[PDB]
Design a protein around this ligand. Structure first.
Ligand code: 9N8
Length: 340
């Protein structure tokens, strides 16, 4: 059914190769999840990604084009092959390169990211790990959100270490204050902080808050945003963090005009609405699409929502490796049953 072109990716997630469907000639990406059922955590992540990707049908979200069925007896089925959209590059590679990246690239890239998030957020899915390298870009300039391994809903299981250890959730440089500080307000606003960091990074072609560790990350955010308000400080989970913030002299926010000199006024207005300490003070993905900065591309009638919401109940279940394997195999079966 597929002719392998060349092996591209490795590792942690598995091996990624480019390929073509022999009959149609259609170019695809094939990801091999080797020994997919050996580790609970990894198997749970595979299951979660398969369901999330099967749930969405959106141009700015990576899609499963095919899932290869077992070709061996059930007991011998050990590695999963997922056929995905072939995406040549990513936003990290574009930002950090000799390629052009004008205000017009920023505007179009931001538009697509926000269009994809509006859809995902309406399904009650918080990606929690947005960063330029997870924003894949093809040769036609289509941006797609990938890597849904860290994604969660509005309600998560207390059985997971992350439930309590929010400061290890995702990547330090794009991690929302609520996760860093355990503010007990974990909504789609987590993603809008990440968007602001990505937006800033596209404007200057360098990371906005590249903290060397936990404290340095907090320092970096406060050097621009100013000291958090007492309402935020009181909500800080840990006393050592709370005490550390209070041990520092008062700081007023620095205008985005100083951080990004001579940058577009409408780009800084939108950036300001995204990068706020308080999750509820942040602009939503839907309201950001209505901002004058994205007026050129914005069509309310071409920016869909996702109905019905995605349910994370399956992920909260304590399953053994074998029970997760059965669930994954049932997902591959459902994929083919829905197609036929
Ligand atoms: O085509 C892809 N990768 C490529 C790169 C470079 C050259 N050729 C091909 C591709 C990757 C994907 C993904 O969802 C993906 C992944 F498999 C592994 C890690 C992150 C992510 Br996000 C879809 N498509």
């Amino acid at each position: 059914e597929y002719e392998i072109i060349e092996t591209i990716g490795n590792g942690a997630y598995g091996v990624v190769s480019s390929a073509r469907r022999r009959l149609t000639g259609q170019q695809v990406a094939i990801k091999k999840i080797p020994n997919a059922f050996d580790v609970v955590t990894n198997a749970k992540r595979t299951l979660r990604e398969l369901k999330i990707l099967k749930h969405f049908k959106h141009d700015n979200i990576i899609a499963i084009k095919d899932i290869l069925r077992p070709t061996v007896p059930y007991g011998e089925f050990k590695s999963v092959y997922v056929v995905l959209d072939l995406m040549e590059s990513d936003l990290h590679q574009i930002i950090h390169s000799s390629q052009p990246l004008t205000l017009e690239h920023v505007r179009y890239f931001l538009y697509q990211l926000l269009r994809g998030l509006k859809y995902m957020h309406s399904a009650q899915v918080i990606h929690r790990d947005l960063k330029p390298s997870n924003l894949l870009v093809n040769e036609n300039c289509e941006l797609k959100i990938g890597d849904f391994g860290m994604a969660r809903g509005l309600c998560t299981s207390p059985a997971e270490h992350q439930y309590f250890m929010t400061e290890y959730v995702a990547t330090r440089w794009y991690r929302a204050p609520e996760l860093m500080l355990s503010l007990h307000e974990y909504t789609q606003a987590i993603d809008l902080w990440s968007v602001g960091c990505i937006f800033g990074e596209m404007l200057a072609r360098r990371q906005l808050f590249p903290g060397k560790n936990y404290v340095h990350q907090l320092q970096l955010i406060m050097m621009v945003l100013g000291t958090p308000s007492p309402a935020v400080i009181q909500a800080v989970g840990a006393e050592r963090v709370r005490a550390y913030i209070q041990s520092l002299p008062p700081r007023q926010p620095v205008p985005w005009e100083t951080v990004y000199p001579g940058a577009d006024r409408q780009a800084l207005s939108l950036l300001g609405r995204m990068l706020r300490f308080e999750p509820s003070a942040r602009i939503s993905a839907a309201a950001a699409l209505r901002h004058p900065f994205l007026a050129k591309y914005h069509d309310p009638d071409d920016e869909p929502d996702c109905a019905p919401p995605f349910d994370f109940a399956f992920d909260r279940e304590a399953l053994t490796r074998e029970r997760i394997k059965e669930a994954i195999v049932a997902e591959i079966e459902d994929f083919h049953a829905r197609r036929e």
